[PDB]
Amino acid sequence: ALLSFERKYRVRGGTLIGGDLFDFWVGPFYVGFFGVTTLLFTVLGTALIVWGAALGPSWTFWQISINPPDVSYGLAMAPMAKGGLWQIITFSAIGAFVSWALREVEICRKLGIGYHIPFAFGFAILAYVSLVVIRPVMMGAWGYGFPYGFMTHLDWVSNTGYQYANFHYNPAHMLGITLFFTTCLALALHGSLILSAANPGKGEVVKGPEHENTYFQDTIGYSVGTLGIHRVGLILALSAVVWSIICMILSGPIYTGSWPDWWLWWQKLPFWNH
Amino acid sequence: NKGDITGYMDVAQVVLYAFWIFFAGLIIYLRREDRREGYPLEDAISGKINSLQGLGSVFSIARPKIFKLKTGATYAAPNFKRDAVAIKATRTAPTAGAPFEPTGNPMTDAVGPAAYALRDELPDLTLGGQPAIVPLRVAPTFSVAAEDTDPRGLPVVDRKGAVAGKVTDLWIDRASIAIRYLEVELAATPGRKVLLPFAATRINAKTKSKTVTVQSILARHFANVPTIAKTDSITRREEDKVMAYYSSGYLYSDR
Amino acid sequence: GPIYLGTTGVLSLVFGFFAIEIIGFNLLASVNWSPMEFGRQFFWLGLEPPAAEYGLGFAPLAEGGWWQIAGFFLTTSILLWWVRMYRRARALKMGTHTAWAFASAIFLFLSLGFIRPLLMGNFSESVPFGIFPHLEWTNSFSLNYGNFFYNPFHMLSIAFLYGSALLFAMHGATILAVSRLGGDREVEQITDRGTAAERAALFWRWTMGFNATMESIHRWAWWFAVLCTFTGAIGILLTGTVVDNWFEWGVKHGLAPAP
Amino acid sequence: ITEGEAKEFHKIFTSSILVFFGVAAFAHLLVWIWRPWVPGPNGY
Amino acid sequence: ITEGEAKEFHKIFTSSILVFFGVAAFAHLLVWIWRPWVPGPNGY
Amino acid sequence: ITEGEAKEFHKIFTSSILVFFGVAAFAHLLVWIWRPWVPGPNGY
Amino acid sequence: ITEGEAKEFHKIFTSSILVFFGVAAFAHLLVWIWRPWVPGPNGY
Amino acid sequence: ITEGEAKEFHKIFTSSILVFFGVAAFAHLLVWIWRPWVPGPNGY
Amino acid sequence: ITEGEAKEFHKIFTSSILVFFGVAAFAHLLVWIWRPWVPGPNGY
Amino acid sequence: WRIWQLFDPRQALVGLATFLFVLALLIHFILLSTERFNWLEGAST
Amino acid sequence: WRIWQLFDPRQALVGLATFLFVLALLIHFILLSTERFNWLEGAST
Amino acid sequence: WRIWQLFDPRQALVGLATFLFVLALLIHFILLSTERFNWLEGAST
Amino acid sequence: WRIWQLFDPRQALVGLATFLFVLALLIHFILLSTERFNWLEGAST
Amino acid sequence: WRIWQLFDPRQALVGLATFLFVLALLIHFILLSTERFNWLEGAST
Amino acid sequence: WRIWQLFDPRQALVGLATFLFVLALLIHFILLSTERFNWLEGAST
Amino acid sequence: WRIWQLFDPRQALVGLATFLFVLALLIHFILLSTERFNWLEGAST
Ligand code: 07D
Ligand code: 07D
Ligand code: 07D
Ligand SMILES: CC[C@H]1c2cc3[nH]c4c(c3C)C(=O)[C@H](C(=O)OC)c4c3nc(cc4[nH]c(cc(n2)[C@@H]1C)c(C(C)=O)c4C)[C@@H](C)[C@@H]3CCC(=O)OC/C=C(\C)CCC[C@H](C)CCC[C@H](C)CCCC(C)C
Ligand SMILES: CC[C@H]1c2cc3[nH]c4c(c3C)C(=O)[C@H](C(=O)OC)c4c3nc(cc4[nH]c(cc(n2)[C@@H]1C)c(C(C)=O)c4C)[C@@H](C)[C@@H]3CCC(=O)OC/C=C(\C)CCC[C@H](C)CCC[C@H](C)CCCC(C)C
Ligand SMILES: COC1=C(OC)C(=O)C(C/C=C(\C)CC/C=C(\C)CC/C=C(\C)CC/C=C(\C)CC/C=C(\C)CC/C=C(\C)CC/C=C(\C)CC/C=C(\C)CC/C=C(\C)CCC=C(C)C)=C(C)C1=O
Ligand SMILES: COC1=C(OC)C(=O)C(C/C=C(\C)CC/C=C(\C)CC/C=C(\C)CC/C=C(\C)CC/C=C(\C)CC/C=C(\C)CC/C=C(\C)CC/C=C(\C)CC/C=C(\C)CCC=C(C)C)=C(C)C1=O
Ligand SMILES: COC(C)(C)C/C=C/C(C)=C/C=C/C(C)=C/C=C/C(C)=C/C=C/C=C(C)/C=C/C=C(C)/C=C/C=C(C)/C=C/CC(C)(C)OC
Ligand SMILES: COC(C)(C)C/C=C/C(C)=C/C=C/C(C)=C/C=C/C(C)=C/C=C/C=C(C)/C=C/C=C(C)/C=C/C=C(C)/C=C/CC(C)(C)OC
Ligand SMILES: COC(C)(C)C/C=C/C(C)=C/C=C/C(C)=C/C=C/C(C)=C/C=C/C=C(C)/C=C/C=C(C)/C=C/C=C(C)/C=C/CC(C)(C)OC
Ligand SMILES: COC(C)(C)C/C=C/C(C)=C/C=C/C(C)=C/C=C/C(C)=C/C=C\C=C(C)\C=C\C=C(C)\C=C\C=C(C)\C=C\CC(C)(C)OC
Ligand SMILES: [Fe+3]
């Protein structure tokens, strides 16, 4: 099935690799060679996750967990019953994410638009890789990656954040929190303004950029613009992800001590050291 | 037995399930709002209204909402105004999911990245009712910031180094202050002027001329840029046509 | 710049300024009026809420009374700011979506500061005014009430926060991608659908099977942002009042194996 | 794409796939001689 | 891209992959005298 | 841009990669005299 | 970028980098007399 | 900036640099007489 | 922006900076009389 | 033979080479995981 | 004297005043922090 | 030559360089990870 | 003398002064951190 | 010599310098990590 | 001996001085991190 | 005497008054902090 305006855009070309073989659609989904690879990796990883659930002790969705190999294994590939399944799932997921991003690139090429969307998804892929590959590799063992479970990855988050006394005192983690809260606040403001301009109340006429700028100027003192707000939102989300990656790289590969104790330098400054 | 509703049920679980019900209803409503443009779905080949849908099709498409405009006209969403089934392209395979192959010149035929939406033949209007996008000649009040470089008089060059023309005017937006289009006088056929989107043009910094580089299309494609009826105002349809023609360069420039 | 305050803005500014002055004066008095010690311990300084024995009444000034006064003034200022952003939208003949999205954040703020202490009978577990004091309040709240990770409404609030970040990273990237087709003129696209909106919808359809419109994506964003704080406020209210241990609740409801 | 280019491609393709499979078979035979990978009833 | 420049490519490309494989083989051979990397029946 | 200018680049490019490689090799020789990095049967 | 002014850069750049390297060599020599950084078989 | 302007900047700039270096050298000499910063064999 | 006015600005700037430096020097002499800030080898 | 007319030589060969390389790397890593076929840290049989 | 034609004596003076005040405040705060030179809380010499 | 008439090195040279360098780096890191072939530590046999 | 032809003399002066001041401040703070060269709270050699 | 027309003779130099410098830094840090080749600490053989 | 036609002299000189300064700062901090070469603290040979 | 042509008398006075008020408030806060000079509490000498 097609939309009322899709046939004129469903054109040949735009593939990065594979040529005409995979240039076709199955329903609404564009397939592509990287889509075929995405399906390959998704099916493999999902089947192996269900296999790990079957090997596990419970079939409860919350309690299903695929655990990484023990820290004693180091960076060596582990037996499939002792974390090798986790490693295979990790690399299949990485392949699936990369293939999804490249499929988005192919769709962007076909539609003649920018690559900002795959570029932004690259940051999510980078955060995932840093959590499952980069940080455990610089830490010396695959056991430091989070287990693939609904609750066990939360337990991993809790244990990792309490290994450093209090993760709330990580300076890059504070910046990540600030940018994550600001992204939500800005999203609420942007959606609210656009919906208030498009729906100005029953019996009223749709407003425009003048009114949109005037509203926020009158309320808070300044505005950003029509495209400045989208650029700011993208930069905010990507900066939050980047500072989260930075805090995770600092926590354990570089800094191993207590983050609350890291803040003594502020109290030891020469102009206040009494 | 603090929060227990029954032997196993409790207040937190009851509130969680209430939120689940509300969130399912909210997803239904959000999809309803999503289906205000482009729906109902048409068959890929025949173009008749036909799709694989369940018992939720009754609630799927909402009643048309009416947007009241300051010009007195109204826009309905969904408007149920479909594009023409026949387009200037032919599928490479008889399957529904097969892609289309342009019959002639895709840039002129407006298929694929060159395709544009049949918007209203009316220019965007500001709060005062005057057209929003006008050349700098018609708007003496506006001026380019002194910290920036005026694109007027700067050569227009493509990705291969071929010069397409010179910038003779700038088209501004009065509603949201910005530069929208650049008026370029083509080197070939002197006196012919074409509109050039600002968002598709980057300045080449220190070139001693700051050539306004256009990576979209080549120099030879500037002669085929769609024209505009008025010399001081541009309609929404012409605007889309120009942006769509320029956006198709990355895919059909070397073809 | 051209900030319109009005009567409601004047009220809100006066109330919030009184609250800020009270908080700052208390912080500076905590270090015996030392500018040096204030700079040294600014993060660690805080204005703590009254103890549990005072209930909801007025505690002595040196023992939480200043906190109660500052908190009430801040709450009044925030409510008057909500009224202000409602009235500005009404005056500009626009919708009150901004006011009703701010209402969710106000609901969460009241749940953290006033509503939950009202339910519990005292202000002892309210949020103190200070950077590190309120971070420590967060940590101690989670630690005392089991594990907040096991709160389902905390789960939902985190999911909607991640969804807000994900949705803005999608929407900004999409609008920048179609910015060369006039996609930044979102209301104009809503009123008269253009090739920018068409290509954005088609990209997302070809990517993940379904798409939104130029208005409904903002509806998605608005609802995600509101639901973050709404679910979080519900979780805060249910924490301790009906569930004393979220880990034990999760164990009972299958979120974790029984110890 | 032309018939002659396709014939040359098929000729080199069958030669290369035969040499690839021969190298793989020789490697597998050497690895089997070194340490076989089929366990016995009682293990290795 | 002309076919003559493809001939030049092919030429120096094969002449360089030959040197690359030669130096790789020499390095592997030297490492083989240093410490062989195929364990025997009793390991190392 | 021009083939002649590319050749003129390549001339001093090889003449400079030569001196870079010579400095690297001389430094490696000095480090080898200081402490060799190839362990013996019993280690270092 | 004119060739003559570019050559004048090259000349003065070479003189300045030579001065910088001479000063760095002097400093490294002084540090070598102070405490050498190359350990012997028995260390420092 | 004109050639004469550049030359004027240059001469008085090096004139001011010489005084700065002299003052820094005098201060460092005074600090050295106060407490030298280069430890001996056994230390300070 | 103009030479004569800038010259007289330098005149009054010197007349002010000399007074400022004299006041600072007198204050530093008084502070040195009160408590010197250069510890000896045994400290203060 | 005509299968190389239905299948582009370049597009087929690039995909085949990438697939073979990934499969070989996966098999080699799986072998490194075990104890019998770990040729680097060779263990006694 | 040449300085004042290139550097505006309205911005140079303001920058100098702010920088000097900041430096003086910093040095005074350092002296207050130190024990020997804290004149407000006089300790042993 | 006919092979490179279609596999022109517009970016294949960069692809091959990136592949070879990464493979060499991975093999070297694996050797460093192993004890027998760690030339920097030089454990006895 | 051509360094001022390439670089604005005003900007060069401003950047050089700022860099020198920051470097001096950093070195002074490092000396204060060190026990031997802390001239304010001086310790015996 | 035609590879200098194939690749930008500016980006090529920049990328090569950035690659060689990063490789050198990595190798030097690895040597610092090793006990035998740590010239700063200088352990005995 | 004509690199400066390829690279802008100003950007080259504002990118090669920063690199050298950062490298010098890093090496000085590394020396401070070692007992032997720390001239501020001071230890035995 | 020429300062009121160079600097704006309306902005200069406001800035000076704000600076003086901030300095006076800071010094009074420091005095309140000190034990000897806390006139409100009045510690014995
Ligand atoms: C002691 C407990 C403790 C503690 C007191 C405390 C406090 C707080 N913290 Mg923290 N934290 C603690 C623990 C701790 N903290 C985190 C992290 C963070 C982040 C990162 C968010 C992000 O960017 O996610 C980025 C997200 C990723 C990883 C994106 C990856 C996703 C991809 C590729 C896509 C996957 C797609 C599929 C599988 C397909 C789906 C298919 C279909 C639907 C069909 C961040 C901003 C953040 C939030 C808060 C706040 C607001 C608070 C409050 C309220 O106090 N914390 C670190 C991290 O992940 O960094 C990357 C991390 O690991 C770690 C630890 C150990
Ligand atoms: C041990 C620590 C711990 C822990 C291990 C863990 C885990 C994680 N959590 Mg959690 N959390 C912990 C504890 C804990 N958790 C929070 C909450 C959240 C949020 C906040 C949402 C928000 O937007 O807040 C932000 C909104 C607020 C607080 C309300 C908006 C405020 C308004 C309008 C007032 C306007 C202000 C002024 C006018 C200025 C006044 C001036 C002056 C006072 C001077 C959220 C989504 C979230 C995120 C994470 C993640 C991602 C993680 C990871 C990765 O570890 N957590 C709870 C809540 O209900 O949130 C709504 C809550 O209260 C609470 C507690 C105590
Ligand atoms: C505790 C005492 C101490 C201390 C251990 C120390 C070390 C050294 N300072 Mg000094 N200095 C100390 C105190 C202090 N200092 C100055 C400053 C400055 C400036 C002036 C700017 C300039 O352009 O100088 C002009 C720069 C020149 C002269 C560059 C020439 C460099 C040469 C020929 C090579 C240097 C290396 C050696 C000679 C190695 C021999 C070592 C051994 C035998 C063991 C600057 C770069 C500079 C150089 C150095 C040097 C060469 C040394 C060596 C190697 O002894 N010092 C700061 C300043 O004014 O910054 C703008 C500042 O405020 C401040 C303070 C507090
Ligand atoms: C970087 C900024 C934000 C961002 C952006 C972003 N995400 C994106 C995009 C963008 C721009 C897309 O275009 C793309 C998309 O199409 O979304 C609809 C996407 C996307 N990001 C998603 C989710 C997501 N994004 C997140 C976050 C973020 N992404 C950032 C906050 C998060 C979290 C945790 O905060 C999640 C959960 C998806 C909706 C989509 C990814 C689609 C995809 O990868 O498809 C290919 C893969 C599959 C269909 C399934 C693969 C299954 C694997 C084989 C197994 C994986 C297992 C896993 C490792 C663990 C699972 C258990 C967990 C409980 C631990
Ligand atoms: C949907 C949930 C998200 C959200 C949304 C949200 N927040 C919002 C809004 C929305 C939709 C607004 O519309 C509103 C706003 O205006 O945003 C710009 C706001 C807002 N939320 C804010 C912040 C905020 N949002 C946060 C987060 C979030 N809110 C969530 C992520 C957070 C955190 C903790 O993450 C914070 C801290 C504010 C910036 C703003 C509300 C402003 C407000 O209430 O101000 C009250 C007024 C004062 C304190 C007065 C101060 C006066 C000064 C002292 C100046 C001097 C005045 C004068 C001199 C006084 C007179 C003196 C005489 C009497 C002597
Ligand atoms: C279609 O497009 C649309 C527009 O366009 C037409 C728009 O416009 C907008 C509107 C969006 C914006 C205008 C910006 C959106 C971007 C962000 C949210 C990220 C950037 C975050 C900020 C700068 C915070 C801005 C929030 C304000 C101004 C709220 C105003 C509240 C009051 C006036 C009440 C009293 C103020 C208080 C109590 C604090 C308010 C917060 C700040 C002013 C910032 C925090 C500052 C401090 C507490 C200390 C720092 C002090 C400063 C900054 C002064 C000293 C200088 C320094 C640098 C330190 C949208 C959404 C939009 O869809
Ligand atoms: C300008 O405003 C904008 C809008 O627009 C106007 C918008 O819209 C949006 C977009 C935003 C919305 C629509 C709002 C909602 C978005 C969110 C809330 C974000 C969260 C998103 C989700 C929760 C949805 C996630 C769903 C995903 C990731 C899709 C999953 C898809 C797959 C798993 C398959 C992908 C398809 C492939 C690879 C091919 C097709 C596959 C099939 C049809 C099934 C299998 C098919 C076969 C068996 C036959 C073919 C098989 C082959 C080829 C062999 C394969 C071999 C195997 C067996 C493996 C934005 C941002 C925007 O700002
Ligand atoms: C146009 O042409 C001109 C004129 C220019 C001439 C040019 C000619 C050219 C370029 C000729 C080139 C020919 C070449 C290079 C041919 C190469 C052929 C090769 C190498 C073919 C290889 C084929 C291999 C295949 C198909 C292997 C398939 C194996 C599979 C699918 C095995 C799967 C195994 C599984 C799933 C099991 C795994 C077990 C483990 C343990 C890994 O599971 C966990
Ligand atoms: C255009 O010109 C006209 C015509 C108008 C003429 C007018 C001319 C005028 C008015 C000119 C003005 C001239 C003036 C006032 C010039 C002043 C010049 C000065 C003071 C120059 C000083 C230069 C200093 C330099 C270059 C010093 C550099 C030092 C460096 C890089 C030191 C680095 C040290 C390191 C990295 C040490 C680190 C050690 C530790 C341990 C700290 O590292 C961790
Ligand atoms: C239309 O009207 C016309 C123009 C016709 C006439 C109008 C005439 C008018 C409006 C005339 C008004 C004249 C007025 C009101 C003039 C005011 C003059 C005053 C009050 C001047 C005062 C100046 C004070 C100065 C410059 C003080 C400088 C002090 C400094 C920089 C001290 C710094 C101390 C430090 C850094 C150390 C502090 C110690 C601690 C312990 C705090 O350090 C941490
Ligand atoms: C010029 O003066 C200046 C501006 C320099 C003074 C300086 C001010 C400063 C530095 C202010 C800010 C200081 C800091 C560090 C503030 C940080 C605040 C933070 C991070 C607060 C975070 C959370 C606090 C929350 C969520 C508290 C909410 C409390 C509420 C809602 C309390 C409500 C209380 C009520 C309604 C009381 C009711 C009882 C009544 C009074 C009705 O009867 C007993
Ligand atoms: Fe629309």
DSSP for chain C? -----HHHHHHHHHHHHHHHHHHHHHHHHHTTT-HHHHHHHTTT--BPPP-GGGTTS---GGGTHHHHHHHHHHHHHHHHHHHHHHHHHHHTT---HHHHHHHHHHHHHHIIIIIHHHHHTSSTTSPPBSHHHHHHHHHHHHHHSS-GGG-HHHHHHHHHHHHHHHHHHHHHHHHHHTGGGTTT-HHHHHHS--HHHHHHHHHHHHHHS----TTHHHHHHHHHHHHHHHHHHHHHHHBTTTBS-HHHHHHHTTSS---
Nearest C-alpha neighbor of C68 from the set C123, C125, C5, C144: C123
Nearest C-alpha neighbor of C248 from the set K18, K28, B3: B3
| P34 contacts chain K (CB < 8 A) | yes
| A235 contacts chain L (CB < 8 A) | no
Q: How many whole angstroms separate alpha carbon L26 and alpha carbon C36?
A: 53
Q: Which residues are within 8 A (CB) of G44 and not within 5 positions of it... i.e. 6 or more apart?
A: N42, O36, O45
**Dmax over Cα atoms in chain H, in whole Å?**
58
The minimal CB distance from C242 to the residues B2, B31, B117 is found for B2
Q: Is the dihedral of CA J4, J7, J10, J13 positive or negative?
A: negative
For atom 66 of ligand 1, the residue with the nearest CA is A161
Ligand 2 centroid from CA A83, angstroms: 35
Q: How many whole angstroms separate alpha carbon B244 and alpha carbon B236?
A: 12
Helices (H) and strands (E) in chain G, counts: 1, 0
Residues from chain M that touch K34, judged by Cβ atoms under 8 A, are 40-41
Q: How far is CA I43 from CA B96, I33, I40, M31, in A?
A: 92, 17, 5, 16
Method: cryo-EM
Q: Which residues are within 8 A (CB) of A192 and not within 5 positions of it... i.e. 6 or more apart?
A: C97, C98, C100, C101, C222
Q: Which residues pair with B212 in a beta bridge?
A: B156, B203
Please work out whether the CB of residue H12 comes within 6 Å of at least one atom of ligand 9.
Answer: yes
- Please report the residues numbered 13 through 42 in chain J whose beta carbons come closer than 8 angstroms to any beta carbon of chain E: 39-40, 42
A273 and A264 in contact (C-beta within 8 Å)?
no
SS3 label, residue J42 = coil
SS3 label, residue I40 = strand
Q: How many whole angstroms separate alpha carbon L3 and alpha carbon D9?
A: 9
Q: Strands B212-214 and B155-158, how do they pair?
A: parallel
Q: Which atom of ligand 2 is nearest to the CA of A184?
A: 23
DSSP for chain L? -TTTTTS-TTTHHHHHHHHHHHHHHHHHHHHHHSSTT-TTT----
DSSP for chain B? --SBSSSS-BHHHHHHHHHHHHHHHHHHHHHHHHTTSSPSPB-TTT--B-----TTHHHHSPPPEEEEPTTS-EEEES---PPPS--SEEESSSSTTPPEEESS-HHHHT-GGG------SS--B-TTSSBSEEETTT-SS----TTSPP-TT-EEEETTS-EEEEEEEEEEETTTTEEEEEEEEESSSTT-EEEEESTTEEE-SSSSS--EEE-SS-GGGGGGSPP-S-SS---HHHHHHHHHHHHTHHHHS--
Q: At C60, which amino acid appears?
A: P
Residue P15 φ/ψ, nearest 5 degrees: -60, -45
Q: Is the dihedral of CA B146, B148, B152, B153 positive or negative?
A: positive
Q: How far is CA P1 from CA B246, J11, P4, in A?
A: 63, 83, 7
Q: How many whole angstroms separate alpha carbon E14 and alpha carbon E23?
A: 14
Residue I32 φ/ψ, nearest 5 degrees: -65, -40
Query: What is the signed CA dihedral for A169, A174, A177, A182, rounded to 10 degrees?
Result: 150
Q: Which residues are within 8 A (CB) of C85 and not within 5 positions of it... i.e. 6 or more apart?
A: A219, C98, C99, C102
Q: How many whole angstroms separate alpha carbon B202 and alpha carbon G8?
A: 34
Ligand nearest the Cα of residue I20 is 10
Q: Strands B89-91 and B201-203, how do they pair?
A: unpaired
- Please report the residues numbered 11 through 30 in chain N whose beta carbons come closer than 8 angstroms to any beta carbon of chain L: 30
Q: How many whole angstroms separate alpha carbon O24 and alpha carbon G27?
A: 13
Check contact K-A (3+ Cβ pairs < 8 Å): yes
Q: Which residues are within 8 A (CB) of M4 and not within 5 positions of it... i.e. 6 or more apart?
A: H1, H5, H6, H9, H10, H13, M12
Q: How far is CA A242 from CA A169, B194, I20, in A?
A: 18, 42, 49
Q: In chain O, which residues are last before a break of more than 2.5 Å from C to the next N? A: none
Q: At B6, which amino acid appears?
A: T
Ligand 12 centroid from CA C216, angstroms: 8
Record the tokens describing residue B207, joined without a space: 């070139």
Q: How many whole angstroms separate alpha carbon A266 and alpha carbon C38?
A: 12
Compute the 3-state secondary structure of chain D and give helix, strand, coil in percent, each to the nearest 5. Answer: 75, 5, 25
| O37 contacts chain N (CB < 8 A) | yes
Q: How many whole angstroms separate alpha carbon E26 and alpha carbon E32?
A: 10
SS3 label, residue I15 = helix
L34 and J41 in contact (C-beta within 8 Å)?
yes
Record the tokens describing residue H17, joined without a space: 């640099």
Query: What is the signed CA dihedral for E5, E8, E12, E14, rounded to 10 degrees?
Result: 90
Please work out whether the CB of residue C113 comes within 6 Å of at least one atom of ligand 11.
Answer: yes
Q: How many whole angstroms separate alpha carbon G43 and alpha carbon O35?
A: 14
Q: At O44, which amino acid appears?
A: S
For D40, which DSSP code?
B
The residue to which tokens 């230890």 are assigned: O43
Q: How many whole angstroms separate alpha carbon B202 and alpha carbon B212?
A: 6
Helix H or strand E segment including A149: strand A148-149
Residue A39 burial class via C-beta count within 10 angstroms: exposed 0-12, middle 13-18, buried 19 and up: middle
Q: How many whole angstroms separate alpha carbon A152 and alpha carbon A141?
A: 18
**Length of chain O counted residue by residue:** 45
Record the tokens describing residue A247, joined without a space: 């805090």
Record the tokens describing residue O12, joined without a space: 């080259």
Q: How many whole angstroms separate alpha carbon B129 and alpha carbon N45?
A: 87
Record the tokens describing residue A226, joined without a space: 């029509």
CA distance M38 to chain I (A): 9
Q: Which residues pair with A29 in a beta bridge?
A: A26
For atom 62 of ligand 5, the residue with the nearest CA is C14
Q: How far apart are the first and last CA of chain K?
A: 46
CA distance N22 to chain G (A): 22
Count other Cβ atoms within 10 Å, centred on residue F11.
Answer: 11
For atom 39 of ligand 3, the residue with the nearest CA is G27
Residues from chain A that touch B47, judged by Cβ atoms under 8 A, are 7
Q: In chain F, which residues are last before a break of more than 2.5 Å from C to the next N? A: none
For A132, which DSSP code?
I
Nearest C-alpha neighbor of B153 from the set B138, B163, B167, B143: B167
Check contact O-G (3+ Cβ pairs < 8 Å): yes
SS3 label, residue K10 = coil
Residue L40 φ/ψ, nearest 5 degrees: -75, -35
**Length of chain I counted residue by residue:** 44
Which site among M18, M34, M37, M44 would you substitute to test the O interface, given the most O Cβ atoms closer than 10 Å to its Cβ?
M34
Q: How many whole angstroms separate alpha carbon M8 and alpha carbon O14?
A: 13
Q: Which atom of ligand 5 is nearest to the CA of C226?
A: 1
The residue to which tokens 């990245």 are assigned: B113
Q: How many whole angstroms separate alpha carbon A50 and alpha carbon A42?
A: 12
The residue to which tokens 């639901």 are assigned: C227
Q: How far is CA C36 from CA A269, A272, J19, in A?
A: 11, 6, 65
Nearest C-alpha neighbor of A93 from the set A66, A67, A129: A129
Q: Which residues are within 8 A (CB) of B21 and not within 5 positions of it... i.e. 6 or more apart?
A: none
Record the tokens describing residue C179, joined without a space: 């910015």
Q: How many whole angstroms separate alpha carbon C61 and alpha carbon C68?
A: 9
Q: How many whole angstroms separate alpha carbon C14 and alpha carbon C20?
A: 10
Q: Which residues pair with A66 in a beta bridge?
A: A148
Residue B206 φ/ψ, nearest 5 degrees: -85, 90
CA distance F5 to chain L (A): 20
Q: How far apart are the first and last CA of chain P?
A: 48
Q: Which atom of ligand 4 is nearest to the CA of A48?
A: 54
Q: Tell how far CA L8 is from the center of its chain.
A: 22
